[PDB]
Ligand binder design. Structure first.
Ligand SMILES: Nc1ncnc2c1ncn2[C@@H]1O[C@H](COP(=O)(O)OP(=O)(O)NP(=O)(O)O)[C@@H](O)[C@H]1O
Ligand SMILES: Nc1ncnc2c1ncn2[C@@H]1O[C@H](COP(=O)(O)OP(=O)(O)NP(=O)(O)O)[C@@H](O)[C@H]1O
Lengths: 361, 395
């Protein structure tokens, strides 16, 4: 019945969906079905070979608790938040304006990676810095992957046939970027990425959290500039820094299986960082009913999931080897109290559902 | 029967205790402070008496001479031959020192070597060792390292997810601190329970002006919250603990902070002081909170939450929990902080007995709780003196 386009803008990803069923009518980047601004070459192929558009927006600060219809004011405050996401937000909003003009008939919705986490309480988003870093400069935990965490936790409630608000859930989005999120009463109550998508657990090239006092030390012993520190934390660490082999989980796995000791330690550390975070969120929620794995690694790596779930009988959580090995939807042992799910994230569909809810009620 | 002295040298201070071993009876204690500076003060206390005096003390050499002369001049010791050994607190032992060590020519070089890491502490600690060998040449000495107890951590706990180089070449990794306090109170917990530490899964919270958590399984530390430096981990009096590392390059770009300013931000302007805007002292922040200061109340709540998050991490690492220990200035005295920290832990079988907790009794868990919760006073100088007995006086 309905045709919704999901946009993600040095690139421009796209996915046109047939709602409300969610059937993919095409996908591409700058084009597939079932070489050579660039939004025109898109709308051209559409013809030579639309009810609404939803736009991914990287940062929504404290201003957007939810997705927002695209008007000039909401565009005003999107471009304002460039002060926090300066290399992503401004061309997300440029993409919103290019569809504002080339395709002027069409309602648009903006979907923020941060909005889902705006239910965190201050004990969870305030860093123990001098107050004025928050109150005058906006430094606080924001969290990301909000669309992914939102989608898979909802999908998990549906599959179990209960209200999401009836469950204490830990959701692990494990890809090149990685984050964990605690969801209780249907609200995100904590998540592991912080002020920027750099922090939290170990990732492909990001370090995640580390002893902050290392950084002043590196400045003084190696004269690292702000750029250099940033490049260290985001481009040189994680699986790539530790292993010395690859940022890609499977390449690291292959090297560890052929004897590489730094690779194996990388996989071991990767699992530990996530296990420690899960542990914090179980503590904070006072228990656990379900644990979700998603992303390119969570959906596909039986080994990462097995290593993350080892020796958790004190929670009533254990895995079934045969189910884990096939990446079945539920992989917990038949006598386990905690459900463990492997759910494929579909952020374009989540975005499409927001365009429906907010542009076609 | 044995007379052991515990020494702790700071950049401008010298703390000391004289203990009767092996019973641990405190003979005297005191502090020389503001050495080299004006307002230098020498305080010495016994069971019965206190003495205090502001006088010029030039270097640590003069502080040691004044302390030794006072031991005999105050009748505490017949003579300095009465002293049977001296234990020295040393800030950082790297990976070299898995245990306390007899002071020799070679221990001092390795301590001075480790100064690249603990720069404002290990050189003075070693000064204190060298002065005592010089002025007490016949008395054996032992170095006790704040880090040694944590050298049983596995690599997937002490490695940070940075490039390998930063560990293999620059020594960057988690070391952990409060080793002597965590050692002491976990061993004391096993003693009070009459079971061997090896039988328990223990989480230990040293909550003072500095704060750290430590997980002890099979009688060994398997994780702890301080890392490369004593700045990190949970929230503290003026120390932030862990924060989003990407904030520091941002502040270097936005505010132009130097390395030294970044480190003052993390160590001296954050924690309770930075959040509350009132004080770094728990009691002062609590007083301001109960009078309506929303920042102070938030400071006390965030302090509890960071500790709870760390406990949660360590319970999962060990696969459960048999006991929880509170100690240090805050852990030992603030029943409120312990209640807020322990709330809603039915998923672990952990609940407090309010009567016992208000009294700071030794065990405060509820009657049907599965987890033991202890309030134990830490005694680092006692732990040190016992290391001196063990190594210099095998007897
Ligand atoms: N079969 C597999 N086994 C293990 N790892 C896999 C497998 N397939 C994919 N991966 C990993 O999963 C990652 C996919 O990342 P992806 O989830 O698409 O991006 P992302 O997490 O959204 N990045 P970011 O938005 O910055 O957080 C790849 O980089 C691979 O390393
Ligand atoms: N009765 C009390 N109730 C609550 N807090 C208290 C009480 N008495 C002391 N405190 C707090 O206890 C703290 C003192 O900690 P203390 O153990 O003396 O420091 P510390 O452990 O030596 N710091 P560090 O240098 O890292 O070893 C202060 O923050 C006080 O506010």
């Amino acid at each position: 019945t309905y045709k919704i386009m999901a946009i993600n803008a040095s690139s421009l990803k796209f996915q046109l969906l047939n709602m409300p069923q969610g059937a993919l009518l095409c996908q591409g980047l700058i084009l597939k079905t079932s070489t050579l601004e660039a939004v025109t070459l898109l709308l051209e192929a559409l013809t030579g070979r639309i009810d609404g558009v939803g736009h991914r927006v990287a940062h929504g600060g404290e201003r957007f608790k939810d997705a927002a219809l695209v008007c000039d004011d909401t565009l005003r405050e999107i471009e304002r938040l460039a002060e926090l996401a300066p290399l992503h937000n401004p061309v997300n909003a440029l993409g919103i304006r290019l569809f504002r003009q080339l395709l002027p008939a069409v309602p648009a919705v903006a979907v923020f990676d941060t909005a889902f986490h705006q239910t965190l309480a201050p004990e969870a988003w305030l860093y123990p810095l001098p107050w004025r870093y928050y109150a005058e400069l906006g430094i606080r935990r924001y969290g990301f992957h909000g669309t992914s965490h939102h989608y898979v936790s909802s999908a998990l409630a549906e599959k179990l046939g209960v209200p999401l608000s009836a469950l204490r859930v830990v959701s692990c989005h494990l890809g090149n970027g990685c984050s964990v999120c605690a969801i209780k009463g249907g609200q995100s109550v904590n998540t592991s990425m912080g002020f920027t998508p750099q922090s939290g657990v170990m990732m492909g090239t990001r370090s995640g959290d580390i002893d902050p006092s290392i950084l002043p030390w590196l400045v003084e012993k190696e004269g690292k500039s702000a750029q250099q520190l940033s490049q260290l934390l985001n481009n040189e660490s994680g699986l790539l820094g530790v292993s010395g082999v690859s940022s890609d989980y499977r390449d690291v796995e292959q090297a560890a299986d052929a004897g590489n000791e730094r690779a194996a330690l990388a996989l071991s550390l990767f699992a530990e960082r996530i296990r420690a975070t899960i542990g914090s969120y179980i503590m904070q929620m006072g228990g656990l009913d379900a644990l979700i794995f998603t992303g390119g690694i969570g959906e596909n790596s039986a080994r990462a999931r097995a290593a993350i779930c080892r020796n958790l009988h004190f929670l009533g959580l254990a895995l079934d080897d045969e189910k884990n090995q096939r990446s079945a939807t539920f992989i917990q042992a038949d006598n386990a109290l905690v459900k463990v799910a492997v759910i494929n994230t579909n952020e374009e569909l989540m975005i499409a559902r927001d365009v429906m809810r907010l542009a076609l009620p």
